[PDB]
Design a protein around this motif. Structure first.
Motif, short mmCIF file in Angstrom:
data_model
loop_
_atom_site.label_atom_id
_atom_site.label_comp_id
_atom_site.label_asym_id
_atom_site.label_seq_id
_atom_site.Cartn_x
_atom_site.Cartn_y
_atom_site.Cartn_z
N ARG A 1 0.83 -1.20 0.00
CA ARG A 1 0.00 0.00 0.00
C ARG A 1 0.86 1.25 0.00
N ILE A 2 1.94 1.24 0.79
CA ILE A 2 2.86 2.38 0.82
C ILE A 2 3.47 2.60 -0.56
N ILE A 3 3.90 1.51 -1.21
CA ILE A 3 4.53 1.61 -2.52
C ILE A 3 3.55 2.16 -3.54
N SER A 4 2.33 1.63 -3.57
CA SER A 4 1.38 2.02 -4.60
C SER A 4 0.81 3.41 -4.35
N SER A 5 0.13 3.60 -3.22
CA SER A 5 -0.58 4.85 -2.97
C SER A 5 0.33 6.00 -2.58
N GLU A 6 1.55 5.72 -2.11
CA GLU A 6 2.46 6.77 -1.67
C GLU A 6 3.71 6.82 -2.53
N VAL A 7 4.41 5.70 -2.73
CA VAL A 7 5.68 5.73 -3.46
C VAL A 7 5.43 5.79 -4.96
#
Lengths: 49, 50
Positions: B1-7
């Motif tokens: 989720r961090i990678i997709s929506s943020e990173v």
């Protein structure tokens, strides 16, 4: 190089404005063209002979 | 989720900003074209004729 409008021949400008009066034939424009064309064929044409 | 929506979302925004940067650079190159080979070239020819 830039070339001014007056460098174009007077006849072509007269034809352009005649076309303009053809597409906008309102009475003031038509009378103005009639007067200016009469001045053309009188002054400039007298000068032409 | 961090990678997709943020990173990865940050990566997409960065790519969009880089595309805007390239578009601005292209517009700048075109404006120097209109200026040097254009408006200053027109200035040169106008000064020559004057």
């Amino acid at each position: 190089k830039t070339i001014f409008v007056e460098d174009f021949p007077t006849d072509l400008i007269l034809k352009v404005m005649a076309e303009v009066t053809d597409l906008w034939p309102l009475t003031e424009f038509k009378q103005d063209y009639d007067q200016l064309y009469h001045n053309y064929e009188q002054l400039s044409s007298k000068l032409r002979f | 989720r961090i990678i997709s929506s943020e990173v990865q979302e940050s990566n997409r925004t960065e790519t969009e900003l880089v595309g805007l940067k390239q578009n601005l650079i292209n517009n700048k190159l075109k404006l120097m074209n209109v200026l040097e080979t254009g408006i200053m070239y027109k200035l040169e020819i106008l000064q020559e004729q004057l």
